[PDB]
Amino acid sequence: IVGGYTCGANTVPYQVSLNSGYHFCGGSLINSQWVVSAAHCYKSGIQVRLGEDNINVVEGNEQFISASKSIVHPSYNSNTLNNDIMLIKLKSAASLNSRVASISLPTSCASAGTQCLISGWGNTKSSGTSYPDVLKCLKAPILSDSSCKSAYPGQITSNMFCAGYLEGGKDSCQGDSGGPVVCSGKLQGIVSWGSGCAQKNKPGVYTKVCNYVSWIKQTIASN
Numbered sequence: 686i687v688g689g690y691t692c693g694a695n696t697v698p699y700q701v702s703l704n705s706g707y708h709f710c711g712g713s714l715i716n717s718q719w720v721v722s723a724a725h726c727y728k729s730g731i732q733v734r735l736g737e738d739n740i741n742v743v744e745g746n747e748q749f750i751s752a753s754k755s756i757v758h759p760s761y762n763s764n765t766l767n768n769d770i771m772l773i774k775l776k777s778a779a780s781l782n783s784r785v786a787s788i789s790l791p792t793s794c795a796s797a798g799t800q801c802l803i804s805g806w807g808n809t810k811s812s813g814t815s816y817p818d819v820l821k822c823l824k825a826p827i828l829s830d831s832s833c834k835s836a837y838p839g840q841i842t843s844n845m846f847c848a849g850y851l852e853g854g855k856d857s858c859q860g861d862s863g864g865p866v867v868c869s870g871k872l873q874g875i876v877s878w879g880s881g882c883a884q885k886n887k888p889g890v891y892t893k894v895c896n897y898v899s900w901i902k903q904t905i906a907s908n
């Protein structure tokens with residue numbers, strides 16, 4: 686997260702870190718046994734780390750649970766990142782508590798202008814690299830689809846939206862991938878992609894979760 690702020694320990698209790706020996710993506714807990722992340726975060730041997738704040742220090746609220754199953758969206762296209770969404774089932778149910786909480790799926794889509802909370806342990810620099818240890822947060826509005834598609838001609842699909850600040854300075858970034866964009870109490874976005882980070886006229890691109898709620902619910906119900 687570039688230009689964000691320190692969330693505060695466990696203030697984003699649905700935020701998970703996906704770990705394969707190191708943090709490599711965020712993900713959002715959607716129930717005790719399921720995380721949603723970006724399909725581009727897919728790897729074998731994922732451990733989901735819940736209750737994390739400082740991802741490099743055991744602070745006492747963590748639950749580390751291995752994934753039993755990863756389900757990448759049927760139509761995920763890694764070239765275009767269209768349908769950049771994946772479900773990860775945990776080997777065992779997370780113990781839900783105030784610091785490890787699920788986030789509601791949308792029942793409908795969010796609108797341009799809606800303010801969202803984007804969070805992650807991704808790079809905090811737009812030039813160069815600094816990875817934070819504690820969770821970073823960014824409040825960012827959903828941008829009109831037209832500004833999104835103007836920003837990234839030929840790359841934005843109906844399964845994507847832009848959020849952030851065309852001015853630059855405030856964005857998600859590498860390492861935030863897969864993490865939540867939560868708007869009005871619902872997971873509306875997954876950190877998906879962008880050009881660099883917090884660059885002028887290159888807002889964050891986010892998987893449009895509300896397109897996937899049927900698939901998520903059906904997939905979870907069947908798995």
Ligand SMILES: N=C(N)c1ccc(/N=N\Nc2ccc(C(=N)N)cc2)cc1
Binds near residue numbers: 856877878
């Ligand atoms: N500007 C953003 N919103 C944004 C930009 C990039 C982004 N990328 N995530 N992850 C990512 C993963 C791997 C590489 C790599 N092969 N070197 C680079 C980036 C996630 C969000």
Ligand SMILES: [Ca+2]
Binds near residue numbers: 738739740743744
């Ligand atoms: Ca920790």
